[PDB]
Design a protein around this ligand. Structure first.
Ligand code: MQY
Length: 293
């Protein structure tokens, strides 16, 4: 079904170190309808892994087999015969959103443009990110690590929901062992998740508000001036991120709606999209989950 000729897959270079194995970048022969070749991201499984691990790999991959959204990085077949287990996916040529935002900084430094930022561009990303998340939540899937570093940028600048899931030494401090038991993205977590360690769609929305803050600051780390333990106390007691410098008032208002203390009072991704859909580009209606059937 999704199994594909491993011979029809040629790895080029490396993108990063995955959990089950190194992640490469290459091309696939006939993996997309009406397409000869296709740039893709190759996910592998180090031979130094038993079946207890190998099977787990194809377990989480079968989860994506049910996903089909313009705003979520799509799966493209899988390999697991007479060679190392592999999984193929749509390749996002501009990388993750945090790196992309960060790479814009130098330009903006020596760029002779003293004009406010484009609210229009930020809304496009917001809606694409919110549309991909609405789709995921609709399929009873909670992300648990929504952050700019886990959003991907396409060649055409479209943003899609993914999960970097690779080494990344530059974002290691984005995680903290709240209680030893695993690395958690504490600066992106809601008050309730910081307490019981439970993630829901309500908390994905809180994280969404933080991603909007990341976009407006060109990915500065949330809660400047506070250590991890200080962030914990501050957020759990009702503290909130500050309005970014030169942030369109409308964007911050959206953020604040995402950061209400009472989880049940936060709007859902569908409500978020409904309140900004009239600001979305024309094409949005064509390929978005929101307008779909
Ligand atoms: C590691 C690889 C991967 O498997 N996923 C991924 C996609 C969808 C889902 S999902 O559907 O379960 C959900 F979205 F719901 F999480 C989960 C994970 C990425 O985003 N990756 C990074 C990546 C891909 C493609 N191109 C890249 C280019 C640069 C860096 C990293 C790139």
């Amino acid at each position: 079904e999704w199994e594909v000729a491993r011979e029809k897959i040629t790895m080029s270079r490396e993108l990063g170190q995955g959990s089950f194995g190194m992640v490469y970048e290459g091309v696939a022969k006939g993996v997309v309808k009406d397409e000869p070749e296709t740039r893709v991201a190759i996910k592998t499984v180090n031979e130094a892994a038993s079946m207890r691990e190998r099977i787990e790999f194809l377990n989480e991959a079968s989860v994506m087999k049910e996903f089909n959204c313009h705003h979520v990085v799509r799966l493209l077949g899988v390999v697991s015969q007479g060679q190392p287990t592999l999984v193929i996916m749509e390749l996002m040529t501009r990388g993750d959103l945090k790196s992309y935002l960060r790479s814009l900084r130098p330009e903006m430094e020596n760029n002779p443009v003293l004009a406010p930022p484009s609210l229009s561009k930020m809304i496009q990303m917001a809606g694409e990110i919110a549309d991909g998340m609405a789709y995921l939540n609709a399929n009873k899937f909670v992300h648990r690590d929504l952050a700019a570093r886990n959003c991907m940028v396409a060649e055409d600048f479209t943003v899609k929901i993914g999960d970097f899931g690779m080494t990344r030494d530059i974002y290691e401090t984005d995680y903290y062992r709240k209680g030893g038991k695993g690395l958690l993205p504490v600066r992106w977590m809601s008050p309730e998740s910081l307490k019981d360690g439970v993630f829901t769609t309500y908390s994905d929305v809180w994280s969404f508000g933080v991603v909007l803050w990341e976009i407006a600051t060109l990915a500065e780390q949330p809660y400047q001036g506070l250590s991890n333990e200080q962030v914990l106390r501050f957020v759990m007691e009702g503290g909130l991120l500050d309005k970014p410098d030169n942030c369109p008032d409308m964007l911050f208002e959206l953020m604040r709606m995402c950061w209400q203390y009472n989880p049940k009072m936060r709007p859902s991704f569908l409500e978020i999209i409904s309140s900004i859909k009239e600001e979305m580009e024309p094409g949005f209606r064509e390929v978005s989950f929101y307008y779909s059937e």
